[PDB]
Every structure is written in structure tokens, then in C-alpha cells.
Design a protein around this ligand. Sequence first.
Ligand SMILES: [Zn+2]
Lengths: 274, 592, 251, 134
Amino acid sequence: ARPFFIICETPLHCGSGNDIGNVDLPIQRERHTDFPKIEASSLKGGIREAFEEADKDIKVGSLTINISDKSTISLAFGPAGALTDARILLFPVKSMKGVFAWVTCPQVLERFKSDLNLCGVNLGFEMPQANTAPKDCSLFINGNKIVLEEYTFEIARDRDESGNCTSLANWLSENLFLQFWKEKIKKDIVVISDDEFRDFVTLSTEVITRLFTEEYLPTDTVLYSLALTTGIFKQDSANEEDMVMEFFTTGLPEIIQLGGNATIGKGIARVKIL
Amino acid sequence: ENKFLFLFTITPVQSFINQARKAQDLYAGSFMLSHFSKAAANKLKMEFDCEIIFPDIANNSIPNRFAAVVNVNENEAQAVGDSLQKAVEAEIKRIGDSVINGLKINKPNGFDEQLSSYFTVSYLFVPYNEDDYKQCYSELESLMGAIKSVRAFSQYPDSERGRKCSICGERNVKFYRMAENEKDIERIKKLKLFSNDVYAVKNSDYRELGPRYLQAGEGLCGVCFTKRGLDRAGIPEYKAKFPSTSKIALFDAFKQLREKRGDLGTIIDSDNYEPQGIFALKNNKNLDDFPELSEMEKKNTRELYEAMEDYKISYSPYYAVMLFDGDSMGEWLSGNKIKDEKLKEFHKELTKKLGEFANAVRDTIKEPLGVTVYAGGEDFLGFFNIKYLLEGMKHLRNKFNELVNLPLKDFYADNTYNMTFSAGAVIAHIKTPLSEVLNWARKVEQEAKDIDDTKDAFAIAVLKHSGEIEKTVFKWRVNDTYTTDLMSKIVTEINNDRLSNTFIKKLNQELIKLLDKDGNYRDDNIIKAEIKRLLMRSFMKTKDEDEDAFKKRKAETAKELQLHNLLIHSNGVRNFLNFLNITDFIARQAKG
Amino acid sequence: MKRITINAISLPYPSMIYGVLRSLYFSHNISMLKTRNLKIKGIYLKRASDLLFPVPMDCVVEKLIPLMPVKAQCISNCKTSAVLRPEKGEQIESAEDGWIDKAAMEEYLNGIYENMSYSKTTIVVDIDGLEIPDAASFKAIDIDETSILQEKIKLYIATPAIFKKGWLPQTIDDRDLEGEINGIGLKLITAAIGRPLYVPKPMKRAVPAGSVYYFEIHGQYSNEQIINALHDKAISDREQDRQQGFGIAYV
Amino acid sequence: NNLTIQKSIERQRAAFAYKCAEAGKSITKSKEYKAYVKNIPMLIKTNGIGATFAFVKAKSEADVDKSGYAYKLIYEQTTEWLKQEPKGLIYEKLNNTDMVKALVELDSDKYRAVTNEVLALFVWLKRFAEGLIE
Ligand SMILES: [Zn+2]
């Protein structure tokens, strides 16, 4: 399989139906932890919509065709294809120094390490412990304290680059981006305690009141997913999954549209393959 | 010995009734169970010598179980049970045979093997020594509750190979209708049904079977079919036309229209218009989805829609399912809370009073209020239009208290006791499949009984689109005032443009940030001040009122809602927030 | 005895496990084209490091109370000649979805029912006679003989079973509840069965995980003969079904 | 279980704000205090915390019956909060100097943290003052 990490460019809003709470158009959430997620029935639909609309020529296996081929898309992935649910890995929160800081709990990092190991990736460093920050962090006022939103946290910086937090930051910077965002992500990555993480992702989501209130995910969010593999490209035979995954990786465009309200520019995202 | 007690029962009660897709199916299932019970009872009463204890057979909907005081020689006793079992089995077989023949359709194969293994009978005599009713009843009930543990069933035959039914998932489809997918084919039996003998018809060919008895690719078992074609079963009592779930939500609009037009009534009661259609035309759609008679049927539906749009009669797409069962019935009937030597009389008195209450409940609940699927003894189950839910709940509780509890006060061991019941209502969108609504309603009803050892509480819930619910649990009385009374008062104030609902959203936003993980903010002063401030801010001034009287209404109204008392007795803060949210939702789904 | 350990409220029936295990084998040996030695010997569902057993229905309720057998003095239509009854009268509500002492249940099997406190997520399986890749995620390990250590004895049912008559061993005869299941004879005296489950293939009715059967030693058998002829041994009616793993029984 | 740090601070802000509102209502000119507590956030927005609190100090009146006593009470109350709320950012200075003097010898980051802290306190102080005083 192949981990492909989605990053948002404009606020993303997937319809979750209706509610009798405060927000009148919430976003889909995990059924038992309230972490946001994107339904596969929408991710795959959007990717197919991108494919059915794109037009270019790729080279897979031996021959060469154009991804607009109705048969190719109809067979490879869906009319039932040889080719999960979206998960949240980073989240932005306002800070007094640095404008914004990314925060992730140890539980999400453990889930991430579990998810990657199927693909064979071996990070090689133990995930960072809770309440830690990189060596060159720029969010610290008075040394031992950071102020996210209007609250104060206590965090200890990693003395040397050998530590877990610095290694995770470096690996994320290198793998996640193919310059400013790369330079920043290696410095501003905080790891708050698990319990405090749930509060941010529940009471820190944009709510634009157009009378009723909608809800969107903040821009600059980082999400990850898994894509696994198992006529025009029939070839001698499908050598393991090397055919379908090759087609998928070759064809994946750089900009995709997800969620509703797309007529007013919402829901644009960037797709990259690990 | 020569004197014996008795207790008859039919096993499948909840699951069997739950397996329904249309309200007609649920009504038919309840009716079938009641009919078998009454058949057994009538056979016993009119042949041997005996007197019934629990259910007054004269009632309309007897429960699944009943007792009696039968006197016979012990040697012959075992025979009677066999007679009753045989009679009930024969009645079931007869009803099935009548249902198949009613439509004059050649019977498929496998019916006799899918209708004669889906029920159970049981009974447990006990010696009676006419000196301690308590001991004999306790022994009988314990033995009856233990005997049911030995569930014996017969395995399905090897012929079982099918595609289920879209109602059950445990039987072979013995019916079908050919959808639009294929114009016509015998391959449907070959591939789609994967079976040999399931009689089917073509989507275009509707002569033998009318629309009511199937739709699209709707599979049905033997029982599912028997439970829908009962209109031709030939039983006089059955009501031929039963309102559907969609129709119930239209109870108010039709009533409002009739007061303005007279001629329109003739079609309204004719049952000649598709009920779910008018909802489609509301959402800017065409009638091509549902093929109909077209003998001006679509014309009549369009006329009704145009008339209702013209008269400005707004209707909502939500309905409500409410059920309630008496609490602590086992202790009450067991004599643990009755005078030392007056249980035998108390049984008959309570049975008579419960029969009277059942008749009263049947009489009061009618259109446009709702329909009573079945109401007998303590139990109950019906549909309510969302614009009359609270009035109905209060009326039922008050009538129960006035007709069953207070009259029996003399028998109670201590005058401070009371006999009450808990209730649970779940709102849902008409599009939602009915089985999930019923199961959720049962769950909320069973949960509301767990508020405290005293019970005497009710629960309301809303079934969201995703599939989760938000509930509120409250006592029936909060300092000599029904809680539903306060809910109705708030709803009426909000609907009449006299109090904006901005004091619910603001309060939700403000008090969420202080709630712990489970939810308990235990500082009274802060919350009381917040409630007072926001409520007094929320009021509005009517164009008729002056600038001097407004300061009197603004103060008197806040003394009626009694928000502080609701908060004190709310057993939590998130419960109070959910209570307010559900009140706002109900107020929204009404006209306002 | 390679006991797999899969990762993600009801533990699926053994029928689904067979299909998943078989399907994985073919995905790596596509040339095989047109498995017969695959036999299951138990399915467990532990969300906790200790394996978890279902709560037997013979025990009724925060704590559990033990039932006892008593020949009734009533006239009824029950098939069994005896029925369970609590020793002392009280409010008896049968536990539903209860999970027996995750490891202390052995005391329950052994007869030590002192305090079966129990609650009011990964799957495990037992395999043999096949080789599969060493790695819903799943993993494969090895083990030698590990299992639940063991004139009448009960018979737990830790996995759904599919009999022939429906609720009694095919050897057992309805005439007098007499027969011999898997050589070791017996006679039926009582039972406690939960709501049957329904489970191309032909649907069947299954005894739920938690059923308890009571029997009496039919004849003269060696303690070893009986002690090993049933314990952890799949008890069913059809040999084909026995392989699939229907009827995991304890003694 | 223990409460998240995101709420252990709000549960303190609200309590302190309510106590301050009651203490204000106690005095003989509660109306003036209620009026004054509704202007400081706007002044902070328009000018800045240092100038706002210098001006507040300017109008302080010694006697407890004078219309300006409210400003002195506000000075003292907002001095108490800054000792505890920032968790030691500006505690070391207030111990031996007037608050305004300290509030002009800080860098930019401490200045912005103190500004946010004061605005967060006042959003609750004025919220309770609007209620408990009519
Ligand atoms: Zn069915």
C-alpha cells in the first residue's frame, strides 16, 4: 500500500447531515473520540471526479494511454477495483509567538506508526513523549512556557537533535513536502497531552454564521490515509499489485476538490504520496 | 387434588413485532398475537370451568399472557394443555391458508415450513391450597420464569437457500416483484433469487396483486407475507385502512384544511391518494418516481398540494413514537406492597381498573392526535404528531393517576405509596426505516427507568440522520408542576414571537467551556446569574404593549418558566442543556 | 498451532473466519488455482491481554449468583424433566452480553464460583494443518499445546454450534433424552439456551455462546477417556461442520 | 479524573470575576463601577494597556464615598489578577513596584500576553457586573 497525505488549502467541510445542537451543519467525527475524519464514500468520489475530468498521457507497464479512457477508470478502481478512512495527524492552534503552532497528541502518533508499518516504512526513532518540543522551537516565552490561545502550557525543549521530537520534525519536513512551510514545520511542532488535545479539536473549529451556523476545518490542516493495491493495462498479468498502484500513483493529480459548497471555493486540498 | 392455577404464554413478543417496515405490518403482528391469545382464552372459558385473573378477555387487545383458576382432576390436567397448543397451531395454519387463498394466487412451495415453526407455547400449573395466595403466586411465577430458559427449536430444512427478505435476514424469500432492471426474464430465479420456487410478477404486470402488497424488488418470507395480506384474512375486527407513518405527520394539515373547504373532504377520506407523494412535490420533484393509478389520482394529489400551498398550511416531515410500561409491576402483583390478607381482591380490582384505563386510552387517542397501535393493561405503543406530543403525555399520565392509582389507595400498605409509569418518546424522519426507530424507542424506554429506584421519569430523544441520539431524562413532577407543562410554556412563548431563542445557543456556547469530561459544574451562583441575565435579555416587546407594561410581563414570565428549579432537579448540567435543545427543536418543527 | 492475532461488539461466527483464512492463502499462491487440511480448534475474543470468555447463562445476577438444579413439582409442557431454580428466592435477571471471569472463569468451570465479578479490541483464532504468511492487520505466532486447562459434568459452549435436531445431540433421543455424543455416553436432564442465531450456503439455527448443558454419565468410562473425549473438542453433528469449528465445548 | 488545563483557568477566571463584581456592588457608587467596567476593553483596543491603566491611576480618588473610588477598586483588582494569571511572567516585578511602572518595562511578547490576560479577565468581569448590578 501507499500512504498519501492530504493537506488543506481552503476550509474543508464534509456534510454530516443535521443536528439539534448548536452548530446547524456539523462535520463528520469519529463515533467515539470526536476526532474529525472524511468518509471514504466522499474521498473516493472526489478522486474519481478528478480522474474523470483530467486529461493527460501516462506510461504504465508497457503501453501508454490517456487517463480519460472511460474503460481504464471504470475497471482499475471502480465501475470494484484492485485499489480507507481519513485520519487527522496535525491541527493548527493560535499562539502568541509564531502566529500559529501545530499540535498532535501521542495517541495519534502511535496510530500513525501502526498505520505506516503495513507499507514497510521504518522511521527508526521512538515517538516523542508528551509535553515536548523541538530543539529550535520559536514558540517559547520566558523559556519554559508556551501560550496557545489564551492559556499557558509547560513544555521542555529537547536539548540535542538526537531526541525524538527533533527527529520526528525533520522526518516530517523531509517526507511531507516535495520552502517556507518546510522551514517552519521543522521548528513548530508541539505535542500536548492527549486529554487536552480533544478540547482543541472540539472547541477550535471555524464556524461561519451565514440565521444558522456552519462549521469547517481550519486551513493548513494535515491528514493522512492509506491506499492499497491487489484490459488496457492487463499485460501478461498483474504482477502482485504493481499494475494498479502504478496507475494510481501515476494518475493522481496535484489539486483535488472534496466536500460540499465547492461552488464558493471551499474544500480544495493537496494530495501527496509518501 | 382438584384445584389448579394456570399461566399461558407465547414466546416471541418483542422481536416478532419489531420486524416491520410499514405501520400496517406492526399493527398486523400485534393483532395476530392478540388473536391467538384470545382464541386460547375463549376455548378455555367456553368449554371447561374457570375464571380469568389478569386480562379481562372482554378487552380489545389482550396481552401475550394470561392466567386463571382452573379446577380439574390432576390425571386429566395434562390433556388441556395439549388441546390449547393444538388449537393455537391450527388457528395459525388456518390464517395462513386463508391469506394465501384470499388473493387467489397459486401457493408457492415452502409455506408450511416457514409459518409453523415461528411461535412457541408454554404453561405451568401449580397446586392450590386456598390458604396462602402469596406463596402460590410466587411459586407459579418463579417456575414460569425458569421454565422459559429451556428454549427448544427445530432446525431449518436443507431446502434453505435464498437471498433473505429486506425485513428479516433469516429465511428464504418466497415472493418477489420484477423491478425495472430487466424488462422480463426467467433468469431472475436463476441468478437474482438464486432459488427454484419463489412466485414473482413483472413490474408492468399488476393484475393478480395490487400495489399495496409489494413494491419494487421487495422480498418477503412466509411470515412477512402473512403479516401483510391479513386484509383478506376474513377476521371482522381488523380495520381495513390503517394510516401509514407518512400520513400521521399530515394529521394536522388535513384538519386545518377541512375547516376551510368542505368538498375536499370526500377525497381525503377516500384513501385514493398516495400519502408519501405530497412530500415529494414539496421538495421540488416530479411524480415519475412512484407510478400510480393515474385515473386522476395524480390530479387529486396535485390538487391537494396546490390547495395546501395556497392556504398557507405548513407541515413538517417529523413524527414521534411513544411507549410506556408500568414500573415495578412484579413487586406490586407479588403482594410485597399490599395489605397482609387482601391480595386476591386486589388482583380483580386492579384488572378491572386497568381494563377501564385501556378503554379510556383508546377513546382519547384519535385523529388528529395520533393512532394507538395497541394499548392494553400497563403497556402502550402509538404514534403522535409532533404538534401534540406533550399534551398527550400529560393527559395519559394524569388519566392513569386519576383512574388506577387513587381509587386503589385504600389497599396500599402505606398511604405514601404510589403506582406510576415511565415513558419514552423518539422522534424520527419519515424516511428512516421503522425497525431502527422502534429499537431505539425500546432502548430509551428501558433506560429512563434507571434514573433512580423510584422510577417515575420520562425520556425524549431525537434520532439524527447519522444514527446517534441526544436524550433528556426528567421526573414527572418538579415541585407540583409537570415538566411537560414548562416545555409547552416555553414552546408557546417562542412560537408566538414573544421570546427569541438566542438564550439557548448563547447558553450552550458559554457553559460548554466550563464542563468537565463527564459534565458537572458544581458552582450554583455563577450558573444562576448566567441564566437570569440571559433569560431577562432574551425577551421581546410586542407592538401592542407599551413601554410600562413590558417591565411587568418581563418579570412575571421569568417566574413561570422556573429555569432555576429545572436546573436544581436536573441531575446534571448537560442534561439541562439537552432539555433546552430538544425544547427548541420541537418548537421549531411546529408552525413557528 | 499457529494462533493468529488480528486487529480492528460481537465476535463473528467461525464461518466468516474460515473464509478470511482461506482467502489469504490463495492470494499468495495464485498458481494454485483449481486447504483441505485446515481445521480450527477454538475462537477467542480478547480486548484485554487476558483472553475473555462469555458469561454462562446458568449464572444470574454488582455480582453473580449461582443457580442449582431442582426437580420441579409443577405440571408443564417443558421437554426437560428438570429446570434450574435459585436456591433462595430473589430478583433474578439473567445477564445479557455478560463476559465471564476472563481468567478466573476456570474456577467457575472447576466449581469454585466464589466471586465471578464481571463487566456488565482484537480477535484471536486457533489453526493447524496449514502454513500462512508470518504477517484489518493480522499476525502469526507459534505455540505447542496451550489451552484452557481442564458421574456427570456440564458442557459450556464458547462458540456457536449447529446440531441436527436443533437443540440436542443427534445421538440424544427425544423419546427419553438418551444418546451418546462423541462416544462418551450421556442423558439429558436440563439446559439453558440463549436466543438462537441465524447463520449460497444454507441458513441454520445455532446455540449461542453461553449455553450450558447438563448430563449424567451413561455408563462405565475411564476418567481419562471422558476427560479428554470432550474438553475443548468441537462437538457438532456433521463432520464437515466440525472442521469449520462449530461447537467449541468445555467440560 | 483531573481537569484539563484549558478549563482549570476558566474556572478561576469566572470565580474571580464574580467576586470582583460583588465587591464592586458593595460600595456606595455601584452604578459608577458598573459603567466604568464596560469601557476599559475599548480603551485597551484603541490606545493600549499601559496608557489605559495610567489614565485609570490618574482618576483615583482617596475617599471611599467619592465617585472615583471605582477606578481605585479597578486598579487594585486588576493588580491582583496579574500576579497569578500569567503563571510567573510578571510576578517578580509587581512585588515591590506599582503595576503601571512594571507594565512599561517589558518586552513585546510579555506585553501581548498581559494584554490577552487582561482582556480575558474583563470579558467575565463585565459579564457579571452587567448582571449583579441594575
Ligand atoms: Zn422475513
